Amino acid sequence: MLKIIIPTTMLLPMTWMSKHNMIWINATVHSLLISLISLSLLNQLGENSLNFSLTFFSDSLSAPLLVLTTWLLPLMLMASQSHLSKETTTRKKLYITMLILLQLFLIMTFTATELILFYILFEATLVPTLIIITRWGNQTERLNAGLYFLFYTLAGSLPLLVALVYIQNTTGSLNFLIIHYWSHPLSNSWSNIFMWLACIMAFMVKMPLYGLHLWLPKAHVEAPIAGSMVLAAVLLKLGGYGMMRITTILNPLTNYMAYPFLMLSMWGMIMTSSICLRQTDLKSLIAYSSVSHMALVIVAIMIQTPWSFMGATALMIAHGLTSSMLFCLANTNYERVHSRTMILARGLQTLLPLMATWWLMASLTNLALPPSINLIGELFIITASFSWSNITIILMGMNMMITALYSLYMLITTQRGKYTHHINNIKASFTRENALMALHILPLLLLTLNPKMILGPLY
Amino acid sequence: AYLTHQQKVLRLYKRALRHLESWCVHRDKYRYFACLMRARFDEHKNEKDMVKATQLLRQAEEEFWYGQHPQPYIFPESPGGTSYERYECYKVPEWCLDDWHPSEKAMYPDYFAKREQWKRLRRESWEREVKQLQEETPPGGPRTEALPPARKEGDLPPLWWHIVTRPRERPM
Amino acid sequence: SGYTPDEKLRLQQLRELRRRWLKDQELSPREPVLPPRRVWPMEQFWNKFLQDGAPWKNVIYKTYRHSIFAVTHVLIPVWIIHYYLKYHVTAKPYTVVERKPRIFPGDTILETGEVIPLMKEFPDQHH
């Protein structure tokens, strides 16, 4: 891991001392180089996770998610040198400083060998993000969005902190391994129930949650594009990654005290998907779409089934790559039309042929048609839910309805139809935009050949 | 705006024959009943009571709605037709040519040169045509959307670019 | 009930501008001016064969096109599939498993040479 953590830090002195206009070029190429180094962690033994040292260890869950972060860093850097090149060098250099620091916390968080060690940097990702939304955002409501995002996740993080230190005072160290091997069946006492809520609400408030999803429309829509990918692609998985890591000392209390959360997520995703079917903002439709998929992940964890986790990891990384790509789609129009209303810029296939295509397989991948790992993600969860309860498919499949209508509805409204008459600013798609988007979908299709890597620790 | 009474009769008569054509299908019967349809039109023409006319229009179109074909005939290239804007996919705005690469632009030399003449001519005539527009605005704002023709000599009709340079109905 | 003189003149002016606009929508016989392209140095044989396109020439000329298409899209694909099947797919067990070869009484089984005895006498009832 030191083979990744140190190089990730080393970009920061380099970017801060690179030449005036070499900042993006130099940073991108080594950022791609680091992701190449991070590809080394895909190998996992048929047994205990790769434990490099007491400081850091990686399993078959962290490694697929880790590579997503490292592969991501070129994508924001390559998605941001168009809406920031008009700013001064120091502020541009500071933007790289936040992004590099944001990655470093993610790398350390996903690889933390100690539960409390996980907690610090997993929470510490707030500071680099909160700067991104509030400083470089491009709307007025970004400030209230920053408060909404920061406070909403902090309201759950603190009870987790009290819960984690309590487990320390009662069971000793919270090392992930010793926790797994030293497991005590949780009683149905009232205190254990409240301990269960503290150890869970911090992660469950973080993906979306139906009722706790109000920060995504504020944050994702108002965030800068480089940031906007991160609030939906990777940090939502931090709330995810915590769930499968923490749901090993809560069994069997999670067996019973999960119906209110399972019930909220199952019905909630139908509601929020229905929001997408009747949304006005392109980014908000994408963000609310991320809510429905992420709520599906929330459902998946709470049965504690080998098939459920097996498709849970695949769904998260598949969704994260897609949601980033769709947020690239919103950016492409946003530079030209300078507005986010959907019906403002209809008729893009006639004007931009390839960008229409890039919007095409992006929509199908969100459609979760086979064999794209979005399908292998959802379909695995369906069987796990179905075995848990047969009525689930009625609620399960009904989501597949709405996720079909709004996905093409976003496509049909924007790309197809007559082009907008009064616009005359749409130029040919920059090779940066097309190349970036190919670097999103192509590995996503390339992953389809062997999803054995992305399947997760249960496999 | 104001749809005069004799206008609606003309529209109703036009829609009646279209619907009657759909019902009759065959030409000789189409000409048969249309003449009967015509025969039951011209005799109610010399009425001095406008109240009779509007009352007549009431049950007449109430008859039209009852007797309308559930599947009326429309030519394909009309609203509801089978070729309604089916060629709209191919049409492209003219201003998109400004984004063409110079290698592509040089691959159509003479036409793009003629495009420059159109651009310069529109640029010059824009000031003249907007000046004419502001010089003859009806008091209290534009009363109707109808555009005034080019009055003087050596000018162009105001607000002409999009209608003149609209993409053809057969773009390919 | 009625091109008013103002709107009639408007339609008159707008017509001829559109007429001249379409009168500039064509292209010269030289147009499109195509840049030079590199050709594969084998088209000379066919185009020289295509100089006349005689019935004694066109059928044979199309034979090469039909032949090369046959080799490229049938011969090469069938070889790699057969190699894949013969030594990789069939190498693992039960990857090419087929239905048991249907046999009937009065037929000798190949690998044993045993003739299965004929089915016992029929009732022999016809129409």
């Binding site: 040919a428 | 492209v92 592509e104 | 064509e26 292209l27």
Partner: peptide, 12 residues
């Protein structure tokens, strides 16, 4: 007679 066709830039 054949005439001009208006298409978006493709070289890019």
């Amino acid at each position: 007679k054949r005439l001009f066709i208006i298409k978006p830039s493709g070289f890019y």
